[PDB]
Amino acid sequence: LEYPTVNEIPVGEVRLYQIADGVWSHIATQSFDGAVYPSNGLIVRDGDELLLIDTAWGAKNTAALLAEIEKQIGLPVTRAVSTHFHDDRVGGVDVLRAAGVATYASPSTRRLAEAEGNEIPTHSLEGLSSSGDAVRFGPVELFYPGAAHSTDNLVVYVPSANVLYGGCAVHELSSTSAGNVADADLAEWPTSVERIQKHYPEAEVVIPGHGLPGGLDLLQHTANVVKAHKN
Numbered sequence: 001l002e003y004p005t006v007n008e009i010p011v012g013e014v015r016l017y018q019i020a021d022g023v024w025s026h027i028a029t030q031s032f033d034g035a036v037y038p039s040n041g042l043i044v045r046d047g048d049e050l051l052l053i054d055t056a057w058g059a060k061n062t063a064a065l066l067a068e069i070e071k072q073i074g075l076p077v078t079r080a081v082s083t084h085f086h087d088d089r090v091g092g093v094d095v096l097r098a099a100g101v102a103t104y105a106s107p108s109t110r111r112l113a114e115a116e117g118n119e120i121p122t123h124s125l126e127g128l129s130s131s132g133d134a135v136r137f138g139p140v141e142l143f144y145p146g147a148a149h150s151t152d153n154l155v156v157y158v159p160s161a162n163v164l165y166g167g168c169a170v171h172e173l174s175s176t177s178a179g180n181v182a183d184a185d186l187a188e189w190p191t192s193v194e195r196i197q198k199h200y201p202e203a204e205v206v207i208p209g210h211g212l213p214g215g216l217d218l219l220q221h222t223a224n225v226v227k228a229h230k231n
């Protein structure tokens with residue numbers, strides 16, 4: 001009941017929320033097509049460093065994110081992974097790069113970001129091109145579930161905490177619509193969610209790309225949202 005909501009975060013400010021020991025989500029707000037949306041990413045403690053998952057959706061929000069991390073946590077962000085190519089995940093990569101953060105994404109995400117005219121993470125993450133692939137990256141596992149919200153979407157698991165960050169492939173429980181589906185695969189999405197359910201059955205916290213964290217129920221709910229959109 002304490003997770004910050006969209007009307008509680010002015011555009012340009014970033015909040016952190018402690019999910020588990022050494023795991024936080026970051027919450028920002030941004031405008032798109034004349035509507036304001038909240039957006040989540042993840043921060044995971046990596047020894048005496050931090051791993052960031054996704055930008056705070058924009059250059060100014062991402063600079064505010066780094067400032068918030070500096071005062072709340074006080075460990076340097078050394079690496080960042082973007083979970084798909086859209087602006088709410090890569091917008092702000094140039095700010096990260098100018099702050100010395102090494103930025104990463106799969107080759108699928110990098111090609112799509114390039115074609116879109118979006119900011120491009122510096123480094124390529126191999127070993128994630130086939131559905132069901134998983135690789136280790138510091139304190140997380142990166143998992144490619146197959147096409148869903150986008151063809152390149154990744155999800156992230158924190159094994160020490162049983163936290164699953166779904167990004168935009170996973171919707172919050174209150175969701176009644178599927179968001180931006182222009183690059184989605186509506187037919188494959190439920191199958192990709194089933195793959196996540198099969199691979200991470202011990203997940204205790206599931207974090208969506210937008211909105212409130214919950215439990216494993218966010219996965220089935222997301223498949224249901226997608227089916228309602230298709231119908």
Ligand SMILES: NS(=O)(=O)c1c(S(=O)(=O)C2CCNCC2)ccc(-c2ccc(C3CCNCC3)cc2)c1-c1nnn[nH]1
Pocket residue numbers: 032037086087088089149168171174175176177178179180181209210
């Ligand atoms: N990940 S993106 O598709 O580009 C994306 C962007 S975006 O700005 O990055 C991109 C910029 C270029 N033109 C297309 C949009 C914006 C809004 C949204 C957006 C987010 C949530 C929602 C609703 C909120 C109420 N509950 C149901 C979901 C609606 C929209 C998304 C998104 N992310 N995930 N799905 N869509």
Ligand SMILES: [Mg+2]
Pocket residue numbers: 001002
């Ligand atoms: Mg309150």
Ligand SMILES: [Zn+2]
Pocket residue numbers: 084086149150168
């Ligand atoms: Zn997206």
Ligand SMILES: [Zn+2]
Pocket residue numbers: 088168209210
């Ligand atoms: Zn999104």
